[PDB]
Write an enzyme that holds these catalytic residues in place. Structure first.
Site, PDB file in Angstrom:
ATOM      1  N   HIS A 192      32.026 -42.791   4.489  1.00  0.00           N
ATOM      2  CA  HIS A 192      30.871 -43.656   4.773  1.00  0.00           C
ATOM      3  C   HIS A 192      31.223 -44.749   5.783  1.00  0.00           C
ATOM      4  O   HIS A 192      31.244 -45.945   5.441  1.00  0.00           O
ATOM      5  CB  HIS A 192      30.311 -44.266   3.505  1.00  0.00           C
ATOM      6  N   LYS A 194      40.731 -39.228  -3.712  1.00  0.00           N
ATOM      7  CA  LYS A 194      40.066 -40.431  -3.187  1.00  0.00           C
ATOM      8  C   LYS A 194      40.888 -41.680  -3.370  1.00  0.00           C
ATOM      9  O   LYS A 194      41.328 -41.997  -4.490  1.00  0.00           O
ATOM     10  CB  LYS A 194      38.815 -40.626  -4.025  1.00  0.00           C
ATOM     11  N   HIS A 244      38.045 -44.879   1.154  1.00  0.00           N
ATOM     12  CA  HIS A 244      37.074 -45.973   1.214  1.00  0.00           C
ATOM     13  C   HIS A 244      37.806 -47.071   1.954  1.00  0.00           C
ATOM     14  O   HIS A 244      38.647 -47.772   1.364  1.00  0.00           O
ATOM     15  CB  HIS A 244      36.647 -46.400  -0.205  1.00  0.00           C
ATOM     16  N   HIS A 252      29.914 -36.529   0.025  1.00  0.00           N
ATOM     17  CA  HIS A 252      30.314 -37.739  -0.712  1.00  0.00           C
ATOM     18  C   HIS A 252      29.265 -38.132  -1.723  1.00  0.00           C
ATOM     19  O   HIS A 252      28.286 -38.751  -1.356  1.00  0.00           O
ATOM     20  CB  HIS A 252      30.543 -38.910   0.276  1.00  0.00           C
ATOM     21  N   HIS A 279      28.181 -39.422  -5.881  1.00  0.00           N
ATOM     22  CA  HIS A 279      28.388 -39.915  -7.256  1.00  0.00           C
ATOM     23  C   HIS A 279      27.374 -39.312  -8.215  1.00  0.00           C
ATOM     24  O   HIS A 279      26.198 -39.689  -8.167  1.00  0.00           O
ATOM     25  CB  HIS A 279      28.314 -41.436  -7.273  1.00  0.00           C
ATOM     26  N   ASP A 330      26.771 -40.760  -0.222  1.00  0.00           N
ATOM     27  CA  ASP A 330      27.192 -41.813  -1.097  1.00  0.00           C
ATOM     28  C   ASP A 330      26.047 -42.232  -2.059  1.00  0.00           C
ATOM     29  O   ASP A 330      25.947 -43.404  -2.433  1.00  0.00           O
ATOM     30  CB  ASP A 330      27.745 -43.043  -0.339  1.00  0.00           C
TER      31      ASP A 330
HETATM   32 ZN   LIG Z   1      33.115 -45.782  -1.127  1.00  0.00          ZN
HETATM   33 ZN   LIG Z   2      31.215 -43.596  -2.888  1.00  0.00          ZN
END
Ligand SMILES: [Zn+2]
Ligand SMILES: [Zn+2]
Ligand SMILES: [Ca+2]
Ligand SMILES: [Ca+2]
Length: 349
Positions: free
Chosen positions: A177, A107, A139, A21, A23, A253
């Site tokens: 997460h 996602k 999420h 996960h 970014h 994350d």
């Molecule tokens: Zn998230």
């Molecule tokens: Zn994230």
């Protein structure tokens, strides 16, 4: 250097791990943070929340090329792309994503061309995901303003996760997460066929509880979604991450923002851990007396969930101290690493 008597292992070797996960952002920020990930991890799930979001397979293809263009020449790293689910994502996108070979998940973010207002809008597309084996990465928070922020993950389990898995019982789901005992127990005990349910756990939710947000002052660099929880929840996450249960695997994350977007009247959510993620995890697992569990969690179980081979490469963590930089630069723009300035106890060789 002689260890004190109380000071388990001086090194830890493991198969080269992956970040399920991540970014990476775009442009200059991408150029700066990608090498941090690529040193540590062979593959990552690259999240699609660019501005505007990556909602199509062609967009993901173009983003993949930008990432590969930013990969420094000596490094080996494969970006596993994702799409941002929206109310208007059609089944046709699911099929072309599956067939592309480079899109490994879709996602779902809490909230029509840029997001999901009602998951009921996405029924045919969820059906296609179930048909094709495309996992849904969730999420898992409600946005309901009448729900206390710290309760939003638990409420999502009841309101959304349970009906989703009931209505689409063959759909592969990753609870991203997770931050609570509620979620860990949900995943740990769920009646699910092999490979149908997984969860990722960040390094920061293992190491910190919500008091970290308020130690000596308010600490925006420790602010992320989902927010850090009570100590009781942190303890449960550590228990899950060190359990050996194949449903839990590593996802940082890591979510960088410019310092000036963190230190403002409305600071952006996200902790930057890609510089030093494996070292943070090593600290957590060491504290728990479970370094022998790091490999499963970091290197095996997420690969298995996504149907990808376990790495034949070995990497090594050394218990050497080092002082983290206070800032890393994206061109002229500084990003503060979580714990920047502090001296941590592991370094990836
Ligand atoms: Zn998230
Ligand atoms: Zn994230
Ligand atoms: Ca309370
Ligand atoms: Ca507590």
């Amino acid at each position: 250097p002689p260890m004190t008597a109380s000071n388990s292992p001086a090194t830890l070797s493991l198969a080269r791990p992956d970040d399920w996960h991540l970014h990476l952002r775009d442009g200059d920020m991408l150029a700066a943070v990608l090498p941090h990930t690529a040193r540590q991890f062979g593959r990552a799930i690259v999240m699609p929340n660019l501005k505007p979001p990556v909602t199509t397979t062609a967009q993901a293809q173009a983003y993949r090329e930008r990432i590969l263009a930013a990969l420094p020449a000596g490094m080996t790293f494969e970006p596993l792309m994702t799409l941002y689910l929206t109310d208007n994502t059609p089944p046709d996108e699911i099929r072309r994503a599956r067939e592309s070979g480079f899109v490994h998940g879709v996602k779902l973010y809490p909230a029509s061309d840029h997001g999901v207002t009602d998951l009921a809008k996405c029924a045919k597309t969820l059906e296609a995901m179930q048909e094709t084996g495309m996992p849904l990465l969730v999420h898992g928070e409600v946005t309901d303003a009448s729900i206390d922020l710290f309760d939003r993950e638990k409420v999502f389990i009841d309101r959304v996760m349970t009906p989703l898995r009931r209505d689409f019982p063959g759909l592969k789901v990753v609870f991203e997460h997770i931050t609570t005992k509620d979620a860990a127990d949900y995943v740990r005990d769920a009646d699910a066929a092999p490979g149908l349910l997984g969860a990722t756990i960040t390094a920061h939710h293992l190491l910190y509880n919500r008091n970290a947000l308020f130690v000596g002052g308010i600490r925006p660099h420790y602010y992320c979604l989902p927010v850090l929880k009570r100590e009781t929840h942190r303890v449960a996450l550590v228990e899950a991450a060190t359990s050996g249960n194949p449903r839990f695997f590593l996802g940082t994350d890591s979510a960088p923002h410019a310092r000036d977007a963190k230190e403002t009247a409305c600071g952006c959510a996200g902790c930057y851990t890609a510089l030093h993620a494996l070292e943070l995890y090593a600290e957590a697992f060491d504290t728990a007396g479970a370094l022998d569990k790091l490999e499963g969690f970091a290197s095996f179980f997420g690969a298995d969930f996504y149907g990808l081979p376990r790495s034949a490469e070995t990497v090594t963590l050394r218990r050497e101290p080092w002082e983290l930089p206070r800032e890393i630069f994206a061109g002229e723009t500084p990003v503060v690493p979580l714990r920047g300035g502090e001296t941590i106890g592991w370094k990836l060789a």
